[PDB]
CSV table of C-alpha atoms (C1' of nucleotides) in Angstrom, one decimal:
chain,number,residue,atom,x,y,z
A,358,UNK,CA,14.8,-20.8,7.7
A,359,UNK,CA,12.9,-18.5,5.8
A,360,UNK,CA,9.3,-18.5,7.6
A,361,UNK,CA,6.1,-18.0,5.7
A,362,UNK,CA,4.6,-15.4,8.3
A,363,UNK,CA,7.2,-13.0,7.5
A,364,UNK,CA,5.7,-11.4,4.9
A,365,UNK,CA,6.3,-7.7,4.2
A,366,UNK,CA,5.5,-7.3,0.1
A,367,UNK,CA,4.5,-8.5,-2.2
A,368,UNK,CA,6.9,-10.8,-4.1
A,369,UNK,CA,8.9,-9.8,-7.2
A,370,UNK,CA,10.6,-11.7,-10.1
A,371,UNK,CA,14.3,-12.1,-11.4
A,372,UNK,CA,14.8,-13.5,-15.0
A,373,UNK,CA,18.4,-13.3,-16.8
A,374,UNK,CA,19.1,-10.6,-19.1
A,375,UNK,CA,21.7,-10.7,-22.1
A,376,UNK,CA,21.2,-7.9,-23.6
A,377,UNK,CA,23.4,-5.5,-21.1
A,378,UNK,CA,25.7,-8.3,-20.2
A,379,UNK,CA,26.6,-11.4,-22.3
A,380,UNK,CA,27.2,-14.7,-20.0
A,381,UNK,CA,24.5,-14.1,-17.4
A,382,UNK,CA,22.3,-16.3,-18.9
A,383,UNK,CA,24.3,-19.5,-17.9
A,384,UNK,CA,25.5,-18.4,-14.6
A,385,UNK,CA,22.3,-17.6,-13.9
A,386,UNK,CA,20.8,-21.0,-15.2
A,387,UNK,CA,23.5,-22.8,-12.9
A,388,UNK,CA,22.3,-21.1,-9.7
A,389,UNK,CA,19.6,-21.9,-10.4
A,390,UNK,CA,19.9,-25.7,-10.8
A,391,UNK,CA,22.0,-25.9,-7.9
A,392,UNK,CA,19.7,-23.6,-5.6
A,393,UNK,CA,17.1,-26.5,-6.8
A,394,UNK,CA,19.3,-29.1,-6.2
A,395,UNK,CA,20.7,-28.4,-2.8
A,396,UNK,CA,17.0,-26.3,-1.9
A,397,UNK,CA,19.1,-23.2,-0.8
A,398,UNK,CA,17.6,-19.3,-1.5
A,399,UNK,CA,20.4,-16.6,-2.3
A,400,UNK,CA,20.4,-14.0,0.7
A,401,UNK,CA,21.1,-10.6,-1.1
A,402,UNK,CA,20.9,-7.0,-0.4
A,403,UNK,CA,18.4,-5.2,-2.7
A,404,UNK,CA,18.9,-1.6,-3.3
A,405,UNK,CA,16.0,-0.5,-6.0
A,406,UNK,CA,16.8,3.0,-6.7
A,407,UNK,CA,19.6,5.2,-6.0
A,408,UNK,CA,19.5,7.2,-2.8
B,1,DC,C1',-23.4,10.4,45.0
B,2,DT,C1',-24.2,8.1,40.9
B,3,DA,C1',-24.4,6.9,36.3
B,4,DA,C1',-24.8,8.7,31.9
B,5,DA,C1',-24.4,12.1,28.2
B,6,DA,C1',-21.3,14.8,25.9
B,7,DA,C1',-16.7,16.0,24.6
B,8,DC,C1',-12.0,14.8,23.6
B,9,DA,C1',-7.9,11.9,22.1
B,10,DT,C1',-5.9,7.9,19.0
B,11,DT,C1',-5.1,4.7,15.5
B,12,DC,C1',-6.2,2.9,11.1
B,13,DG,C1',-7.7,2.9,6.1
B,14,DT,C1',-8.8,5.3,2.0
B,15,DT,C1',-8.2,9.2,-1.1
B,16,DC,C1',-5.4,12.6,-3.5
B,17,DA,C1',-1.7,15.6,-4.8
B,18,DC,C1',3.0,15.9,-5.9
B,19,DG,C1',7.7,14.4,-7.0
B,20,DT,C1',10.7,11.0,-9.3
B,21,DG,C1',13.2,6.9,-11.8
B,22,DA,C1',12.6,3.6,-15.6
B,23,DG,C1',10.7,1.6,-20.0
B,24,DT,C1',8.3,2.3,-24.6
B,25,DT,C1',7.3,4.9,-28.7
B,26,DC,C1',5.9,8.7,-31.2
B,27,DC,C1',7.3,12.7,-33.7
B,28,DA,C1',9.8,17.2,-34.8
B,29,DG,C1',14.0,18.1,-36.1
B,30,DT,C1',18.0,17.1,-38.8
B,31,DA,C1',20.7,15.2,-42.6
B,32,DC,C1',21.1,13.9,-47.3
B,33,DA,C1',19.8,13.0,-52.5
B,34,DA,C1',17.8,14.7,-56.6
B,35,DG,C1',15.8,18.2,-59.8
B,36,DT,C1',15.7,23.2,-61.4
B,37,DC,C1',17.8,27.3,-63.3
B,38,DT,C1',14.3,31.4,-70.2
B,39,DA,C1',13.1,31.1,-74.9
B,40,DG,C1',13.8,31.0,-79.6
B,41,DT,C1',16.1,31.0,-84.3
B,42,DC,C1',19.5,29.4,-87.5
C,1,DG,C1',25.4,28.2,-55.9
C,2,DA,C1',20.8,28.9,-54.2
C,3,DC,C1',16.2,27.2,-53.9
C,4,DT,C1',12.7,23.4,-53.7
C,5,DT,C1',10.9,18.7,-53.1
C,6,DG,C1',11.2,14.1,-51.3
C,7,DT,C1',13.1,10.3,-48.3
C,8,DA,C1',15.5,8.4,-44.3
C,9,DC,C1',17.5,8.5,-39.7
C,10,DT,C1',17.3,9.8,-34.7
C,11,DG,C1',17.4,11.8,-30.0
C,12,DG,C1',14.1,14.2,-26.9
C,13,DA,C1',9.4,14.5,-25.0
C,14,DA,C1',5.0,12.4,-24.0
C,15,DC,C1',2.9,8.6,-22.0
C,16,DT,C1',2.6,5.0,-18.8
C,17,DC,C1',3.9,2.4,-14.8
C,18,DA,C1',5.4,2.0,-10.1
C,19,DC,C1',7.0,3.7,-5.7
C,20,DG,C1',7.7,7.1,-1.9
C,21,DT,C1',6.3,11.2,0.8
C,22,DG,C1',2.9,14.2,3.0
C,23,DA,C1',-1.9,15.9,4.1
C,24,DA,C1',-6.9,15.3,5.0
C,25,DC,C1',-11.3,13.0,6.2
C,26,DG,C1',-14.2,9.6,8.5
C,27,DA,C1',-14.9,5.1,11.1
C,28,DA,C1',-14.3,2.8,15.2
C,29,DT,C1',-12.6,2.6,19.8
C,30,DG,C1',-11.2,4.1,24.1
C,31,DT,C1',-10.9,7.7,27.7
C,32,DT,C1',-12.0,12.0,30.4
C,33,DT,C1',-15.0,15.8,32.0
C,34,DT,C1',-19.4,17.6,33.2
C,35,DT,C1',-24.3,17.5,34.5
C,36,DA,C1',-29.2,15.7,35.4
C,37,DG,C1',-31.7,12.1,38.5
DNA sequence: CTAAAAACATTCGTTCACGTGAGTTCCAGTACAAGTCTAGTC
DNA sequence: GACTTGTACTGGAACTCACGTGAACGAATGTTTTTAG
């Protein structure tokens, strides 16, 4: 479902981070063998910067 | 009347100036430890 | 106890990066008004 005319930006990336929270790492590692597995992208509301 | 030359209006891209949040690091400022405190005789 | 010298620690500011907002100029196009043939 997600088309590959609808560009707006540039793409970023996400990578796991332990040092502010301990435990991401793996959760994060899981979603993203299962997103692989099953070919599903994780619909999410991005809010950069306060106000 | 007629077309054409000039003028006017619009949208886009690039440039710049300013403001602001986030990450990195460099340094002034602070804290703390150690030494000094006069020179001589008997 | 007061001064001096030397060493170690540390939070704030400088720098950079990236984004958003607003203002200005010129290119290219389209459209309207006016004037000579």
């Amino acid at each position: 479902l997600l088309k590959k005319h609808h560009y707006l930006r540039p793409s970023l990336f996400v990578y796991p981070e332990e040092s502010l929270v301990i435990g991401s790492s793996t959760l994060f590692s899981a979603l993203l063998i299962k997103c692989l597995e099953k070919e599903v992208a994780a619909l999410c509301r991005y809010t950069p910067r306060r106000n």
